[PDB]
JSON list of C-alpha atoms in Angstrom, two decimals:
[
{"chain": "Q", "resi": 1, "resn": "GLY", "atom": "CA", "xyz": [-101.86, 49.98, -264.69]},
{"chain": "Q", "resi": 2, "resn": "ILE", "atom": "CA", "xyz": [-103.47, 48.42, -267.76]},
{"chain": "Q", "resi": 3, "resn": "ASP", "atom": "CA", "xyz": [-104.39, 49.68, -271.24]},
{"chain": "Q", "resi": 4, "resn": "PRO", "atom": "CA", "xyz": [-108.16, 50.38, -271.30]},
{"chain": "Q", "resi": 5, "resn": "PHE", "atom": "CA", "xyz": [-110.54, 49.12, -274.00]},
{"chain": "Q", "resi": 6, "resn": "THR", "atom": "CA", "xyz": [-113.35, 47.51, -272.02]},
{"chain": "Q", "resi": 7, "resn": "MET", "atom": "CA", "xyz": [-116.74, 47.57, -273.77]},
{"chain": "Q", "resi": 8, "resn": "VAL", "atom": "CA", "xyz": [-117.60, 51.12, -274.78]},
{"chain": "Q", "resi": 9, "resn": "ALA", "atom": "CA", "xyz": [-114.33, 52.99, -274.33]},
{"chain": "Q", "resi": 10, "resn": "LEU", "atom": "CA", "xyz": [-113.68, 56.69, -274.78]},
{"chain": "Q", "resi": 11, "resn": "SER", "atom": "CA", "xyz": [-111.12, 56.92, -277.56]},
{"chain": "Q", "resi": 12, "resn": "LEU", "atom": "CA", "xyz": [-109.52, 60.35, -277.30]},
{"chain": "Q", "resi": 13, "resn": "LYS", "atom": "CA", "xyz": [-106.66, 61.79, -279.27]},
{"chain": "Q", "resi": 14, "resn": "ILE", "atom": "CA", "xyz": [-104.01, 62.55, -276.69]},
{"chain": "Q", "resi": 15, "resn": "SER", "atom": "CA", "xyz": [-101.72, 65.37, -277.70]},
{"chain": "Q", "resi": 16, "resn": "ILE", "atom": "CA", "xyz": [-98.37, 65.56, -275.94]},
{"chain": "Q", "resi": 17, "resn": "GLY", "atom": "CA", "xyz": [-96.50, 68.43, -277.53]},
{"chain": "Q", "resi": 18, "resn": "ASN", "atom": "CA", "xyz": [-96.50, 67.22, -281.13]},
{"chain": "Q", "resi": 19, "resn": "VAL", "atom": "CA", "xyz": [-97.35, 63.60, -280.42]},
{"chain": "Q", "resi": 20, "resn": "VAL", "atom": "CA", "xyz": [-101.01, 62.86, -281.10]},
{"chain": "Q", "resi": 21, "resn": "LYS", "atom": "CA", "xyz": [-101.92, 59.37, -279.92]},
{"chain": "Q", "resi": 22, "resn": "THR", "atom": "CA", "xyz": [-105.40, 57.90, -280.08]},
{"chain": "Q", "resi": 23, "resn": "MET", "atom": "CA", "xyz": [-105.86, 56.46, -276.59]},
{"chain": "Q", "resi": 24, "resn": "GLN", "atom": "CA", "xyz": [-108.73, 54.34, -275.35]},
{"chain": "Q", "resi": 25, "resn": "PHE", "atom": "CA", "xyz": [-109.90, 55.29, -271.88]},
{"chain": "Q", "resi": 26, "resn": "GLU", "atom": "CA", "xyz": [-112.61, 53.81, -269.68]},
{"chain": "Q", "resi": 27, "resn": "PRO", "atom": "CA", "xyz": [-115.66, 56.10, -269.18]},
{"chain": "Q", "resi": 28, "resn": "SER", "atom": "CA", "xyz": [-115.53, 56.06, -265.37]},
{"chain": "Q", "resi": 29, "resn": "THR", "atom": "CA", "xyz": [-111.79, 56.73, -265.47]},
{"chain": "Q", "resi": 30, "resn": "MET", "atom": "CA", "xyz": [-110.72, 59.63, -263.28]},
{"chain": "Q", "resi": 31, "resn": "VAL", "atom": "CA", "xyz": [-108.50, 62.37, -264.69]},
{"chain": "Q", "resi": 32, "resn": "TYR", "atom": "CA", "xyz": [-105.55, 61.48, -262.44]},
{"chain": "Q", "resi": 33, "resn": "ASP", "atom": "CA", "xyz": [-106.03, 57.88, -263.52]},
{"chain": "Q", "resi": 34, "resn": "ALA", "atom": "CA", "xyz": [-106.15, 58.83, -267.19]},
{"chain": "Q", "resi": 35, "resn": "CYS", "atom": "CA", "xyz": [-102.84, 60.60, -266.60]},
{"chain": "Q", "resi": 36, "resn": "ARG", "atom": "CA", "xyz": [-101.64, 57.34, -265.01]},
{"chain": "Q", "resi": 37, "resn": "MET", "atom": "CA", "xyz": [-102.57, 55.65, -268.28]},
{"chain": "Q", "resi": 38, "resn": "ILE", "atom": "CA", "xyz": [-100.73, 58.08, -270.57]},
{"chain": "Q", "resi": 39, "resn": "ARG", "atom": "CA", "xyz": [-97.52, 58.12, -268.53]},
{"chain": "Q", "resi": 40, "resn": "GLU", "atom": "CA", "xyz": [-97.46, 54.35, -268.85]},
{"chain": "Q", "resi": 41, "resn": "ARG", "atom": "CA", "xyz": [-98.46, 54.13, -272.53]},
{"chain": "Q", "resi": 42, "resn": "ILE", "atom": "CA", "xyz": [-96.60, 57.21, -273.76]},
{"chain": "Q", "resi": 43, "resn": "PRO", "atom": "CA", "xyz": [-93.24, 58.03, -272.10]},
{"chain": "Q", "resi": 44, "resn": "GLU", "atom": "CA", "xyz": [-93.30, 61.68, -273.10]},
{"chain": "Q", "resi": 45, "resn": "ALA", "atom": "CA", "xyz": [-95.90, 62.33, -270.39]},
{"chain": "Q", "resi": 46, "resn": "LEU", "atom": "CA", "xyz": [-93.04, 61.79, -267.94]},
{"chain": "Q", "resi": 47, "resn": "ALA", "atom": "CA", "xyz": [-91.33, 64.96, -269.18]},
{"chain": "Q", "resi": 48, "resn": "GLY", "atom": "CA", "xyz": [-91.96, 66.55, -265.81]},
{"chain": "Q", "resi": 49, "resn": "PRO", "atom": "CA", "xyz": [-93.84, 66.35, -262.48]},
{"chain": "Q", "resi": 50, "resn": "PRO", "atom": "CA", "xyz": [-97.25, 64.71, -262.58]},
{"chain": "Q", "resi": 51, "resn": "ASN", "atom": "CA", "xyz": [-99.13, 67.63, -261.00]},
{"chain": "Q", "resi": 52, "resn": "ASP", "atom": "CA", "xyz": [-97.14, 70.13, -263.03]},
{"chain": "Q", "resi": 53, "resn": "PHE", "atom": "CA", "xyz": [-98.70, 68.63, -266.14]},
{"chain": "Q", "resi": 54, "resn": "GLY", "atom": "CA", "xyz": [-102.38, 67.94, -266.67]},
{"chain": "Q", "resi": 55, "resn": "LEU", "atom": "CA", "xyz": [-105.16, 66.98, -269.05]},
{"chain": "Q", "resi": 56, "resn": "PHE", "atom": "CA", "xyz": [-106.34, 69.77, -271.31]},
{"chain": "Q", "resi": 57, "resn": "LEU", "atom": "CA", "xyz": [-109.69, 69.25, -273.02]},
{"chain": "Q", "resi": 58, "resn": "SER", "atom": "CA", "xyz": [-109.17, 70.46, -276.57]},
{"chain": "Q", "resi": 59, "resn": "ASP", "atom": "CA", "xyz": [-111.99, 72.15, -278.45]},
{"chain": "Q", "resi": 60, "resn": "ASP", "atom": "CA", "xyz": [-112.18, 74.00, -281.77]},
{"chain": "Q", "resi": 61, "resn": "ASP", "atom": "CA", "xyz": [-111.11, 77.22, -280.07]},
{"chain": "Q", "resi": 62, "resn": "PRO", "atom": "CA", "xyz": [-108.09, 77.42, -277.68]},
{"chain": "Q", "resi": 63, "resn": "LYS", "atom": "CA", "xyz": [-110.10, 79.49, -275.20]},
{"chain": "Q", "resi": 64, "resn": "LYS", "atom": "CA", "xyz": [-112.77, 76.79, -275.00]},
{"chain": "Q", "resi": 65, "resn": "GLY", "atom": "CA", "xyz": [-110.20, 74.30, -273.79]},
{"chain": "Q", "resi": 66, "resn": "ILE", "atom": "CA", "xyz": [-110.38, 73.58, -270.07]},
{"chain": "Q", "resi": 67, "resn": "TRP", "atom": "CA", "xyz": [-108.19, 71.79, -267.55]},
{"chain": "Q", "resi": 68, "resn": "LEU", "atom": "CA", "xyz": [-109.63, 68.50, -266.32]},
{"chain": "Q", "resi": 69, "resn": "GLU", "atom": "CA", "xyz": [-109.52, 68.19, -262.53]},
{"chain": "Q", "resi": 70, "resn": "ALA", "atom": "CA", "xyz": [-107.84, 65.03, -261.20]},
{"chain": "Q", "resi": 71, "resn": "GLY", "atom": "CA", "xyz": [-110.79, 64.43, -258.88]},
{"chain": "Q", "resi": 72, "resn": "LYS", "atom": "CA", "xyz": [-113.21, 64.33, -261.80]},
{"chain": "Q", "resi": 73, "resn": "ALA", "atom": "CA", "xyz": [-113.81, 61.63, -264.41]},
{"chain": "Q", "resi": 74, "resn": "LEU", "atom": "CA", "xyz": [-113.47, 61.70, -268.20]},
{"chain": "Q", "resi": 75, "resn": "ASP", "atom": "CA", "xyz": [-117.18, 61.05, -268.80]},
{"chain": "Q", "resi": 76, "resn": "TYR", "atom": "CA", "xyz": [-117.84, 63.90, -266.37]},
{"chain": "Q", "resi": 77, "resn": "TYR", "atom": "CA", "xyz": [-116.28, 66.28, -268.89]},
{"chain": "Q", "resi": 78, "resn": "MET", "atom": "CA", "xyz": [-118.53, 65.14, -271.75]},
{"chain": "Q", "resi": 79, "resn": "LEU", "atom": "CA", "xyz": [-115.58, 63.41, -273.41]},
{"chain": "Q", "resi": 80, "resn": "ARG", "atom": "CA", "xyz": [-116.34, 61.09, -276.32]},
{"chain": "Q", "resi": 81, "resn": "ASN", "atom": "CA", "xyz": [-114.62, 58.82, -278.82]},
{"chain": "Q", "resi": 82, "resn": "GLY", "atom": "CA", "xyz": [-113.02, 61.12, -281.35]},
{"chain": "Q", "resi": 83, "resn": "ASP", "atom": "CA", "xyz": [-112.37, 64.07, -279.06]},
{"chain": "Q", "resi": 84, "resn": "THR", "atom": "CA", "xyz": [-108.94, 65.60, -278.64]},
{"chain": "Q", "resi": 85, "resn": "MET", "atom": "CA", "xyz": [-107.24, 66.13, -275.32]},
{"chain": "Q", "resi": 86, "resn": "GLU", "atom": "CA", "xyz": [-103.79, 67.57, -274.90]},
{"chain": "Q", "resi": 87, "resn": "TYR", "atom": "CA", "xyz": [-101.87, 66.21, -271.95]},
{"chain": "Q", "resi": 88, "resn": "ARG", "atom": "CA", "xyz": [-99.57, 69.16, -271.45]},
{"chain": "Q", "resi": 89, "resn": "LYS", "atom": "CA", "xyz": [-97.82, 71.16, -268.75]},
{"chain": "Q", "resi": 90, "resn": "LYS", "atom": "CA", "xyz": [-99.86, 73.58, -266.65]},
{"chain": "Q", "resi": 91, "resn": "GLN", "atom": "CA", "xyz": [-98.65, 77.21, -266.84]}
]
């Protein structure tokens, strides 16, 4: 794939374990595609199976954080430039 930055791009802070990387995603980018972007830009995403991990929308409270569905898009989850999302393992 290719590193996104086209026009208005959703710059989210991707947390993988302890690695927080500000990543620029396209608004219409699907969650499985955003994962495709991290795995390629940050190697730590490849710490396990792709469906075993996932995108976790980070809020101010841990219980407000939700798991982004692969079949949905980033914009769909009200994601913005400056938000934090932790690409981490499910369960």
